[PDB]
Design a protein around this nucleic acid. Structure first.
Ligand SMILES: C[NH+](C)c1cc(NC(=O)CNC(C)(C)C)c(O)c2c1C[C@H]1C[C@H]3[C@H]([NH+](C)C)C(O)=C(C(N)=O)C(=O)[C@@]3(O)C(O)=C1C2=O
Ligand SMILES: [Mg+2]
Ligand SMILES: [Mg+2]
Ligand SMILES: [Mg+2]
Ligand SMILES: [Mg+2]
Ligand SMILES: [Mg+2]
Ligand SMILES: [Mg+2]
Ligand SMILES: [Mg+2]
Lengths: 105, 122, 132, 67, 101, 37, 584, 192, 304
RNA sequence: GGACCUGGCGGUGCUUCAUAUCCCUCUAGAGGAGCCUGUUCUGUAAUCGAUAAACCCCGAUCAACCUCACCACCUCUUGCUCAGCCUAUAUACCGCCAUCUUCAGCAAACCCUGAUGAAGGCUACAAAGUAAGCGCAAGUACCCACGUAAAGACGUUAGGUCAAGGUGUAGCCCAUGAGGUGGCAAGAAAUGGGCUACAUUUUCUACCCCAGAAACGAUAGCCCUUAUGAAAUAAGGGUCGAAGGUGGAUUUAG
């Protein structure tokens, strides 16, 4: 039920269980595609509805953007090896933090 | 400013008593000052009275499953202010009661208005 | 330990406002109520559907104003004027705000059968009362 | 507290005085005594209107004629 | 689109009892008067015994308005203990305090 | 009655004038379930 | 109507109109979705019953071929559905009654064989606000043509009229009115002659349709059409139908189309109105105002009748009768703007404040034009205290002023010589959104650096000019890539030098260098004065080099000043001599 | 954003013009830096521009004493005055005998259905009815449960019919038919 | 600070608006009127008075920000800067010097108040050493500058006077003199009227004391004040009582006679009788039951 | 393996205390009888969860049907639902809590000591500590500043609930889901907690405390009537006249 639905912050807290993902959505998109003038397209003053080919093309573009976002999660980052991989002995931390007394290192 | 003096003599309300009852003493006495000032410049004798508050208290369990010994107790603070009114006209009752219930406050308000219209026997 | 409406202290970096900073034992000692309806006062009959309408409106507002309501709503109900007061951020476009204002206005009007008034307040950033 | 809510101008006799819908049988009968009881109960009803009161009365009339 | 099948069964009870409410009243008065002959009440006994056993308001369980929980419901808001605790502790419900006295 | 509530929210979300995070969560989860299960 | 948040505040009239159309958009948004799903809103809780909160049903609930279904579809205004099942009724052989055939042809003549528009008509007013001063005749020719339905021959209406057995006055009147509305003027006249042959009576709106059709007929003299109007009103009297306000207002609109030759006919029309005893309306006065006001008239007694009209019209409260009362206030006060008459404009504002003439103001565009002309006139011939009092009384409470109104403010303040109000009205223009108005920028800068000012005014001007320069820098990548004006540069530089922002003046002399704009001699002399104060021969040689680079004819005087006023090394003296030799 | 009207406005302005209606706070509209809340230990009460608790307050800003004064200058039309019925309770009792109780219970929400709001009850004085001796004896014997001894007040309740006006009709009808049956002498009165 | 300056300006302009808002276009709008006006404008309803709305000047609203102790060259102003407690240590130095030159010539402030006056965090033992130093200066015979130094460090006492409030003797009824007093003990209210003479006559609730009080303990409780003050058969009391039980009523009645015989006795004897313990309300009232218990303080069974 | 650091333990020392918690003490009870109500065990075709302190009139401010998820029998397939499941996992969780807590500690960011180890940071006649923030405190509620409430951080016991609901993981869809009808809640026994008693300061009657008369105890069993309900559990009356003689060790509360 809509009433027993609950927020995603609570949902992800309960799911991740770390105490012992909706940014790819524009504000007026639905699968029926009743695109309004206030949302999606800007404010000719004409209410309309897109076709099946436009709907399937738009959702295919959204999904391929989703797998692109998944890839830009799962690239491989290159860490320089220090004395061996999975070690810390030659790892270069950056230059030291700039001192509060107008000092640079 | 339409008036429409129509036909029939007054319904003659004596003692319209307004019981204003809420959760908040500051709302109650600010409304008291508002209504007393209003009736003061209207010219009708308004009087104040404070019926004692009633608190509806009850108990619920705190845990979901066990532990009856640890309970949360909740209460409702229900606070009365009696604004009894005598010697006011029927039309004046309409206009004063009109403005009072229009600028009635929020959920911290109820107003039980007790009208004693007099009339003649038959 | 009591875990009712108390946000815990992590280490000192957690922005938090007055509302969810204060605990339920300060419920009107310091906080006050987010919804003003006269249903829960000693003589009244309809408080149950008042409450289910309250939770309906809060979830509806959170779902139709997506990611812009700063903290929780002010739901007042006087006579038949239902008032929804909002604390919405300044990040979307004002035509979109007015669009959703009218949309919520007359949707709630035809759902609750009363004059419903949306009173908005725009804020730049989520206000911080303390850091926990 | 009574915006609308006319109840078709019933005006104080249709609600409580139900002789005209009582349609007197032999009044010494237990059927008539039961009808007095039902008439008094429907008179004490403030929630039902005269239409439901009478329709209830002729439901009793129909069932008693069936038996 | 409900909380559970039990609450759907309960709202079926509510609706169909509310619509089979009038005749049950009529002949339950015909029960609990002492005016009529016993057999003329007996024929009524079989017809109420034939009236369906889901409209009798003895099956009516006041479950919570928000989530199906039979025992632990306060009638004044039709709310269960801990859902009432939830709302009254976030302070989305007016007038309720913590009772300290 | 819950039918007007739940079905109106179903329709309005699928209109896209409502964003329900609970249903979004189960949509993503069941997408992954049909992906692997 | 707008909210009370400063972020949600519309700054301009265009922004206010955009917000209002967004609100109306969202309103009919939910109207569409609620009428699409009426099952979710059938549960009424409010008592008493509210039918205008109850959702409206647009689908025909009567499915069998019946006259009740015909009336239902007529009330639902489904033109093709009504026509199709009327054909179904004719195929079934059911005799369709006279009143509902009349109603079907009413719908057909009103809508022109087309469905009602799904969009509520608020469009066809989207003209840009940068073309309000030129070519009103071609504006009339390209704006008086609403793309309505032309009356096509052999339409469904004519089919029904030919099919129906017993023609009556109602059907004939409807057909004449529909033909006139859809521009079949000659066909409507022929059908009126057929009505007169068939011995029927035409009512008021049909007669006004006939008057409009006779006037809109092509290739006839104004004398002939006036004689035709007289014949039509004689026919109206012979048919014993009483003319009215809308009749004579249609006549007045027609003679307004008929221009100069119809002024004495207009006077005769209004005299006949007062003789018969029907009160002339604001739209009657609007029609005669817009008739008598024409560009190119050298007499203006046609503008003295406006004083006559108001001598009739002070002190009266009015009711809605005729749609052109907003146009009345707009047109009469356009006369005020044309005539430059402060007393008559004040009399107009007084008549406005009497009663609900503030409601008779009408739409937002008419209100904006009204108050813009009002405050233009006030700034044109009033004193500065009452102009600023009207400024704080009207702006932005009544309207959002325009860029012409701002430069008129600047002209009023310049004639006033009360230049201390310049930063305040500048901040007001910036908060109203006139930041990117180059004409406003140029006007404020030249009026601002025209004269020498007290130092507090100078530093306020320095702050304002710094913000102007900030806006000029912070306009990135637009198609109107406006180059920095030389006058605006010179004025900003002069203000910065007068207030003492010499380093800012030097870096924006670098900005002069990058935009290749010719500096002014007064500015160069002020730079020499600043170099005298700072004792900087390097900066003096710098600005002299800029003057030599632009080959200005004052460079020899600048050099002679530099040699007379500074201790100069020999290589810098040689460089200056070389620059003088190059310029010579 | 914009520089707000809080500092745009000046002194000597009309607050009835600013706030006509009961509205929530709107601190940009309010020319008053209202600080709300329990402060932090080394801090101040939190500011004006974003206060959920200041929006939660019932906000009696729209009713200021000059607004009451000017508003009731507007409302002074809608009233007549009383006759010389006097402050004396016995005087007004003599002028107008009966006293009828008919009240309303105002809720706040969608519906205005408070059924108990139809309750009506009539109090009349025998010393003002003036015409009952063995009729008052018969009257008391009819209505035994009411008419307390200390004060001569007869209180007849009606809650039997849904409408308030026919409840008033029930009250006046019971008054007149109790009066008529009290004056109707019966044949078994002497065998008391 | 510029924050403080523009806040002060905003407060001035706001209080000007606020006086114009309510009724007070005259310039003189005082702080209690400001509090009353904002109390009416925003009806508080919050139990915490600091959670109620406030309109004060930014000096009282904002805390005391300490000024910069060094300029644009380093070089801190006070010579005792590097102690980190410059005000406290300068004070210690000054008092010690005043003791030194005094010797060569021959209630108290709380820690929080001294912290407010110094705008420096302070230790308990530091405050104690300061107090001992000032006590040494007081015990030493000191001059007037020393005395005013001690007095600007010393504060008021706000002593309370504890003579029993004598009710007036109202000469009324026909010709008799009486006092009407009140008493309360354990949800029982008793208001009594004693006439000076009448040789001892009690009228509890219209009847006599042997009728309303069949218990000799209750009659003894009634006797108690008269027997203490040796005026047994001299006065008369008519009393009306609501609520409670027999002993609660007897105690409330007794408190009423004591708090009226106070008016009818001399001041030394009423101080003596207050010492005897008859003029003080007994605050011992019934406690509350608690959830999870079996009474006020009684608990359930096995817990250990 | 040697030497440490930190913590926990010690039938570990010294010193000071606890006061209804430590003993001697003060009062009233349990454990002994009957009844009510949970639990264990047995039984049944017949739910589940709690189960040292922190379970045992516990989820329940409460089961004739309903509740109900249990069992028996018989039926339903896009099933109120763009299904659902009270299927398992409280050792994935959220949610809401217990316990220490009838505590005062927890601490971001720094600095110093230890030849720059784990670590540690105490001396007011002062030897390296400074501290944002949470908590105690303070401020609130009730009748006072007293008392009682509320409040009590970090963490402990993988402490309690996937069965309030939501939910990750794994599973089902001829099923483990859905509906209808009928039954399940009985004691060879034991135990926790309450209620009533074993009487003389008691019992019955009037009175609600100045009398008269005795010289005991079931809210259990059976019968009748009534309340509510479709279908009795509760109430009253009648009937009966149990065991029981103030309860050991131990223990509870103030
Ligand atoms: C057997 N031990 C290793 C155990 C295991 C688990 N969980 C698992 O390993 C199971 N994991 C799967 C099922 C595979 C997902 C466990 O989950 C548990 C425990 C311990 C129990 C002990 C419980 C016990 N009570 C219930 C009789 C008890 O006396 C105590 C106690 N200290 O009083 C407990 O610790 C206990 O309650 C408890 O919590 C246990 C577990 O949680
Ligand atoms: Mg590797
Ligand atoms: Mg378990
Ligand atoms: Mg199952
Ligand atoms: Mg606990
Ligand atoms: Mg506690
Ligand atoms: Mg505390
Ligand atoms: Mg465990």
């Amino acid at each position: 039920s809509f009433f027993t639905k609950l927020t995603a912050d609570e949902l992800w807290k309960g799911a991740l269980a770390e105490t012992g993902l909706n940014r790819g959505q524009i504000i007026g998109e639905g699968r029926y595609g009743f695109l309004w003038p206030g949302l999606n397209v800007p404010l000719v003053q004409t209410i309309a509805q897109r076709s099946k080919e436009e709907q399937e093309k738009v959702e295919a573009d959204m999904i391929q953007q989703r797998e692109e976002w998944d890839r830009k999660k799962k690239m491989k980052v290159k860490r320089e090896r220090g004395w061996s991989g999975n070690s810390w002995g030659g790892i270069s931390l950056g230059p030291p933090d700039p001192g509060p007394c107008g000092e640079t290192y | 400013p339409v008036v429409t003096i129509s036909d029939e003599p007054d319904i003659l309300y004596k003692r319209l008593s307004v019981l204003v009852k809420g959760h908040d003493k500051a709302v109650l006495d600010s409304y008291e000052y508002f209504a007393v000032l209003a009736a003061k410049e209207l010219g009708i004798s308004i009087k104040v009275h404070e019926p004692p508050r009633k608190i509806e208290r009850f108990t619920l369990l705190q845990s979901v499953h066990i532990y009856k010994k640890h309970r949360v107790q909740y209460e409702m603070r229900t606070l009365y202010r009696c604004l009894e009114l005598e010697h006011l006209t029927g039309s004046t009752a309409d206009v004063y009661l009109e403005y009072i219930q229009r600028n009635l406050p929020e959920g911290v308000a109820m107003e039980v208005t007790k009208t004693q219209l007099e009339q003649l026997p038959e | 330990k009591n875990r009712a409406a108390r946000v815990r202290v992590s280490k000192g970096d957690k922005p938090v406002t007055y509302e969810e900073a204060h605990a339920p034992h300060y419920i009107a000692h310091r906080k006050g109520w987010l919804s003003l309806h006269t249903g829960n006062l000693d003589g009244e009959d309809h408080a149950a559907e008042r409450t289910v309408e309250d939770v309906f409106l809060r979830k509806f507002m959170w779902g139709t104003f997506p990611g812009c309501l700063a903290d929780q709503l002010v739901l007042k109900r006087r006579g038949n004027q239902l008032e929804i007061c909002a604390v919405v951020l300044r990040q979307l476009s004002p035509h979109k705000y007015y669009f959703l204002v009218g949309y919520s206005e007359t949707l709630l009007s035809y759902f609750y059968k009363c004059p419903v008034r949306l009173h908005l307040q725009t804020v730049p950033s989520k206000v911080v009362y303390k850091y926990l | 507290n009574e915006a609308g809510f006319d109840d078709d101008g019933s005006e104080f006799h249709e609600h409580i005085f139900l002789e005209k819908h009582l349609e007197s049988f032999p009044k010494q009968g237990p059927i008539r005594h039961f009808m007095e009881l039902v008439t008094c109960g429907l008179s004490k009803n403030p929630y039902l209107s005269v239409k439901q009161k009478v329709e209830h009365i002729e439901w009793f009339r129909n069932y008693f004629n069936e038996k | 689109h409900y909380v559970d099948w039990r609450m759907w069964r309960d709202v079926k009870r509510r609706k169909m009892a509310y619509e089979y409410a009038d005749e049950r009243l009529r002949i339950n008065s015909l029960r609990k008067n002492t005016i009529l002959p016993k057999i003329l009440q007996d024929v009524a006994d079989e017809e109420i015994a034939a009236l369906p056993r889901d409209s009798c308001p003895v099956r009516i369980r006041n479950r919570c308005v928000m989530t199906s929980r039979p025992r632990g419901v306060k009638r004044r808001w039709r709310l269960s203990r801990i859902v009432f605790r939830h709302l009254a502790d976030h302070g989305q419900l007016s007038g309720i305090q913590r009772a300290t006295w | 009655n819950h039918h007007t509530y739940a079905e109106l929210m179903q329709t309005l979300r699928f209109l896209g004038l409502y964003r329900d995070e609970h249903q979004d969560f189960m949509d993503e989860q069941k997408r992954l379930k049909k992906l692997r299960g | 109507v707008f909210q009370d948040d400063p972020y949600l505040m519309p700054a301009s009239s265009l922004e206010s109109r955009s917000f209002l159309l967004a609100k109306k958009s969202g309103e009919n948004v939910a109207k569409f979705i609620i009428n699409s799903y009426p099952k979710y809103f059938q549960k009424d809780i409010a008592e008493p019953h509210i039918p205008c909160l109850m959702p409206e049903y647009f689908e025909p609930q009567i499915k069998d071929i019946s006259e009740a279904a015909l009336k239902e579809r007529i009330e639902l205004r489904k033109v093709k559905a009504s026509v199709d099942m009327f054909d179904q009724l004719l195929q079934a052989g059911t005799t369709v009654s006279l009143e509902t055939t009349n109603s079907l042809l009413d719908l057909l003549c009103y809508y022109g064989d087309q469905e009602p528009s799904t969009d509520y008509h608020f469009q066809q007013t989207g003209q840009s606000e940068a073309l309000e001063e030129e070519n009103d005749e071609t504006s009339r020719r390209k704006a008086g043509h609403q793309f309505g339905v032309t009356w096509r021959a052999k339409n469904n209406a004519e089919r029904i009229f030919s099919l129906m057995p017993e023609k009556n006055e109602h059907s004939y009147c409807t057909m004449i009115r529909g033909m006139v509305k859809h521009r079949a003027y000659e066909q409507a006249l022929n059908l009126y002659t057929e009505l007169l042959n068939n011995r029927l009576h035409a009512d008021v709106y049909t007669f006004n349709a006939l008057i409009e059709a006779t006037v809109c007929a092509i290739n006839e003299k104004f004398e002939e059409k006036w004689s035709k109007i007289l014949e039509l009103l004689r026919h109206m009297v012979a048919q014993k139908v009483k003319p009215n306000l809308q009749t004579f207002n249609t006549i007045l609109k027609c003679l307004r189309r008929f221009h100069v030759f119809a002024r004495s006919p207009a006077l005769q029309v209004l005299r006949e109105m007062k003789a018969i005893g029907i009160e002339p309306s604001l739209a009657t006065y609007h029609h005669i105002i817009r008739l008598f006001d024409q560009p190119g008239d050298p007499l203006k007694r046609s503008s003295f009748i406006i004083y006559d009209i108001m001598n009739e019209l002070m002190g009266k409260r009015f009711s809605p009768k005729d749609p052109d009362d907003d146009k009345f206030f707009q047109s009469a006060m356009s006369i005020c703007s044309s005539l430059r008459d402060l007393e008559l404009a004040y009399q107009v504002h007084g008549l406005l404040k009497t009663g609900d003439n503030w409601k008779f103001i009408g739409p937002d565009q008419h209100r904006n034009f009204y108050y813009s002309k009002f405050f233009d006139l006030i700034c044109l011939m009033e004193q500065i205290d009452v102009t600023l009092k009207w400024y704080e009384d009207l702006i932005p409470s009544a309207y959002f002023p325009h860029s012409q109104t701002m430069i008129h403010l600047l002209q009023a303040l310049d004639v006033a010589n009360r230049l201390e109000v310049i930063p305040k009205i500048w901040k007001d223009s910036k908060e109203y959104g006139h930041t990117f108005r180059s004409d406003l920028r140029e006007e404020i800068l030249m009026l601002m650096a025209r004269d020498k000012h007290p130092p507090e005014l100078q530093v306020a001007f320095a702050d304002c000019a710094a913000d102007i320069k900030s806006a000029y820098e912070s306009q990135p990548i637009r198609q109107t890539a406006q180059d920095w004006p030389a006058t605006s540069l010179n004025c900003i530089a002069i203000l910065f030098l007068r207030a003492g922002r010499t380093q800012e003046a030097w870096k924006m002399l670098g900005l002069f260098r990058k935009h290749n704009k010719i500096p002014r001699s007064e500015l160069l002399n002020e730079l020499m004065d600043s170099a005298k104060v700072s004792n900087s021969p390097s900066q003096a040689i710098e600005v002299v080099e800029l003057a030599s680079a632009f080959s200005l004819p004052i460079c020899e005087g600048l050099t002679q000043r530099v040699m007379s006023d500074f201790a100069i090394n020999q290589e810098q003296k040689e460089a200056l001599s070389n620059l003088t030799a190059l310029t010579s | 954003a914009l520089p707000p009207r809080t500092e745009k406005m000046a002194v000597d302005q009309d607050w009835p013009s600013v706030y006509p209606v009961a509205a929530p706070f709107k601190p940009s509209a309010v020319p008053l830096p209202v600080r709300m809340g329990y402060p932090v230990k080394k801090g101040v009460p939190m500011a004006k521009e974003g206060n959920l608790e200041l929006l939660k307050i019932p906000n009696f800003l729209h009713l200021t004493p000059v607004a009451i004064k000017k508003h009731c200058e507007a409302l002074k039309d809608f009233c007549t005055e009383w006759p010389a019925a006097l402050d004396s309770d016995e005087k007004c009792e003599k002028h107008f005998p009966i006293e009828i109780d008919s009240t309303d219970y105002v809720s706040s929400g969608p519906s205005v259905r408070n059924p108990r709001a139809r309750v009506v009850v009539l109090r009349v004085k025998l010393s003002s009815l003036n015409l009952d001796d063995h009729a008052k004896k018969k009257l008391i014997k009819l209505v035994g449960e009411r008419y307390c001894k200390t004060t001569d007040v007869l209180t007849i309740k009606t809650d039997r019919c849904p409408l308030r006006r026919q409840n008033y009709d029930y009250a006046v009808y019971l008054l007149t038919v109790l009066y008529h049956e009290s004056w109707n002498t019966e044949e078994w009165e002497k065998s008391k | 600070e510029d924050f403080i300056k523009k806040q002060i300006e905003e407060f001035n302009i706001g209080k000007r608006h606020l006086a114009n808002m309510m009724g007070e276009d005259p310039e003189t709008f005082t702080q209690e009127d400001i509090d009353r006006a904002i109390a009416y404008l925003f009806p508080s309803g919050l139990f915490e008075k600091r959670a109620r709305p406030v309109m004060k000047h930014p000096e009282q609203i904002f805390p005391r920000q300490r000024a910069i102790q060094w300029g644009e060259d380093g070089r801190p102003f006070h010579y005792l800067f590097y102690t980190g407690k410059q005000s406290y240590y300068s004070l210690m130095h000054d008092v010690y010097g005043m003791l030194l030159n005094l010797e060569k010539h021959q209630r108290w402030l709380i820690k929080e108040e001294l912290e407010e006056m110094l705008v420096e965090k302070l230790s308990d033992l530091d405050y104690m050493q300061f107090i001992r130093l000032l006590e040494k200066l007081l015990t030493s015979q000191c001059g007037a500058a020393e005395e005013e130094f001690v007095q600007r460090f010393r504060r008021s006492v706000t002593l309370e006077s504890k003579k029993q409030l004598i009710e007036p003797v109202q000469y009324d009824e026909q010709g008799m003199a009486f006092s009407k007093s009140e008493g309360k003990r354990k949800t029982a209210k008793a208001e009594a009227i004693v006439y000076k003479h009448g040789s001892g006559r009690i009228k509890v609730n219209g009847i006599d004391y042997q009728l309303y009080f069949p218990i000799t303990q209750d009659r003894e409780q009634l006797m108690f004040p008269f027997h203490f003050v040796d005026r047994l058969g001299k006065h008369d009391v008519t009393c009306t009582v609501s609520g409670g039980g027999r002993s609660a009523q007897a105690g409330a009645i007794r408190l009423a006679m004591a708090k009226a015989l106070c008016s009818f006795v001399t001041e030394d004897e009423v101080e003596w009788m207050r010492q005897a313990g008859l003029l003080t309300t007994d605050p011992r009232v019934r406690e509350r039951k608690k959830p999870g218990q079996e009474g006020a303080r009684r608990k359930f069974t096995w817990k250990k």
